[PDB]
Every structure is written in structure tokens, then in C-alpha cells.
Design a protein around this ligand. Sequence first.
Ligand SMILES: NC(=O)c1ccc[n+]([C@@H]2O[C@H](COP(=O)([O-])OP(=O)(O)OC[C@H]3O[C@@H](n4cnc5c(N)ncnc54)[C@H](O)[C@@H]3O)[C@@H](O)[C@H]2O)c1
Length: 311
Amino acid sequence: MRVLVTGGAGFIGSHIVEDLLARGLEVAVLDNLATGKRENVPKGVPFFRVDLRDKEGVERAFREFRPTHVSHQAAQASVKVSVEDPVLDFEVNLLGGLNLLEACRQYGVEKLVFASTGGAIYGEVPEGERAEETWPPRPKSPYAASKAAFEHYLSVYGQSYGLKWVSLRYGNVYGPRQDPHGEAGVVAIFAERVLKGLPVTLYARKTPGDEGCVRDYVYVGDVAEAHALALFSLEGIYNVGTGEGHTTREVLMAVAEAAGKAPEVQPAPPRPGDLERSVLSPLKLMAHGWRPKVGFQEGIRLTVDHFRGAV
Ligand SMILES: NC(=O)c1ccc[n+]([C@@H]2O[C@H](COP(=O)([O-])OP(=O)(O)OC[C@H]3O[C@@H](n4cnc5c(N)ncnc54)[C@H](O)[C@@H]3O)[C@@H](O)[C@H]2O)c1
């Protein structure tokens, strides 16, 4: 099996590359380094410094590497950026995505595994409930629209052309090598600021001083494992979440514990157009044997250590 990982120089992408290499697979990376780092790509892994919006460059990567499978992690992956720059989000996530699908058809790729988003696709998840894969998309931002739209394209490419596909709707993915810009960016923000002894802003869920918003935090190593399972054996839509929510206050407490510091917390009103609660139903994926191996406290500890370990 020869796997091309778009966005493989990025946070989730680099963990996927390492995971796949440890399963005897030939792996290549396609990445324009917009946010990814050349240093994240292991020695000996073919690296195509290519923008997915450059059809001729995508074609070159396919010709040179000859992938059998494609893992599509490359994206404009900041909700904020998408609201302030919907055209960039569209060009990268849809136009770039489509160039990739067209190369997949041309080269007879056997499966495309897509990084989708549970947080941005499902909308508000009521108390007591967990978003399930049959819930209808309720996109609120351009990022959500481009991800939802790309899933429609995967479905129509499967139906029309026979391209097999899986859409992994990730929860809030955190861990070593993450930046502060993705859906679980708060983990990096808190880790860096708590370590530096800077005040942290705790945005309210509804009232300044409350516990803050609820998300399904899933450790990046556990996401990489779900990705391998998906690649080998799955088709269709699967949530990749723990099925348990944590509040922003709980994240801060875990970061403080791991850093061994008592941070200065400053409450703020809710950030406008942020979800109060998102928790994903993990049942569909867990029926195929996947479970998080790394608990929340342990994962936060591992993330903090990574931020401590720079020079
Ligand atoms: N909490 C999360 O981090 C989260 C949650 C849900 C879904 N996702 C999705 O997972 C995937 C990976 O996210 P991440 O957190 O690792 O972010 P990331 O920015 O670290 O990784 C994305 C990679 O894509 C590359 N890239 C961006 N635009 C490109 C382009 N036009 N052509 C080629 N490469 C390009 C970047 O350089 C980067 O290395 C994304 O699709 C993202 O939307 C992330």
C-alpha cells in the first residue's frame, strides 16, 4: 500500500505519517507548508512541496509517488480564518480538494480518507446528547460549509465514479505539535501561557465565571489510530471523539496540574457565535474496535511536556 498524506507536515498529518510508517506502509507527504513544518516529515519520506490548488503540482506528486490510497488532511483549518477569509477557505478546502479527487480518479486510487470535523458540522448538541453520524450538517461558518460540501463531493464521487471514501469527523484534536489555530487551539494557548506565567482568558459559556464551553477533546495519537483503522477497513462517515465532554475550566485545570503552576484566570463574556456544547457519539467507530488509549489528564500532560521541551 502506498499512502499519500496531504497536509502530512501538519499537526494531525505528521502523527498519521508516523503511525502509518510503523505499519509497514510506503508513505509520502504533500504539503505547501502554510502551517506545517518541514521538520515534521521523517527522513526518507518523499515530500512534495505542492499547493493543492496547483493542479500541475498535484499531478506531478501522483506521477512520482503512484499512491494506492490518499489521506486528505490538508486544509485551511481555522474557523476564525474562514470567517475573515471565506475565499481562502473555499480555494483550499474545495478547489484544492477537487483537484485531489480528480487526480484520484485519474490514478485509480483505491480509497480517500478525509479529515472532516464533528464540531463544525453538527451544530449545538443538547445536554445529555451526543452527535451521531446520521444527524444533518448544520454549518455556521465558511470552514464548516467547505467541509460539509466536500463530504457531498465524496459521496457523489463514490456514487458516480466508484471512488471509495471515508469521512472522519474529528472532535477537538489536541497534542504535541499542535498550533493555537485549530479547533482545539485552546490547549496550546493555555499550555504556552500557563508555562510562561501569563494571565489566561476564560471565556464564559453563558455567564462570565461559569465553567466555559464543552467540547469532545480527543488525543492526536488516538486520532492517528482511528485513521489507520479507517484506511484499512472503513467506508462512509465516522465520528472520531471520546464521547465525553470537557469544559474549558477542566482543560485549564489539567494544564495547570501538568505545568505545576497556579495560573491567573481572567473571565470574559462568551465569544460570539461559539457553540455552548459539542460531544460526539463514538459508538459507530468503537464497534470496529477503536478506543482512546490516552486519557484526558495523560494527554494534556503529554501536550504540556511538548511545549515545555522547546528551547
Ligand atoms: N482540532 C483539530 O485540530 C481539528 C478538528 C477537526 C478537523 N480537523 C482537520 O484535520 C486536518 C488537519 O488539521 P491540523 O489541526 O493538523 O491543522 P494543520 O494546519 O497543522 O495541518 C494542515 C496541513 O495542511 C497544509 N496545507 C494547508 N493548505 C494547503 C494547501 N493549499 N495545499 C497543500 N497543503 C496545505 C498545512 O501546511 C498543514 O501542514 C484538517 O483538515 C482540519 O480541518 C482538525
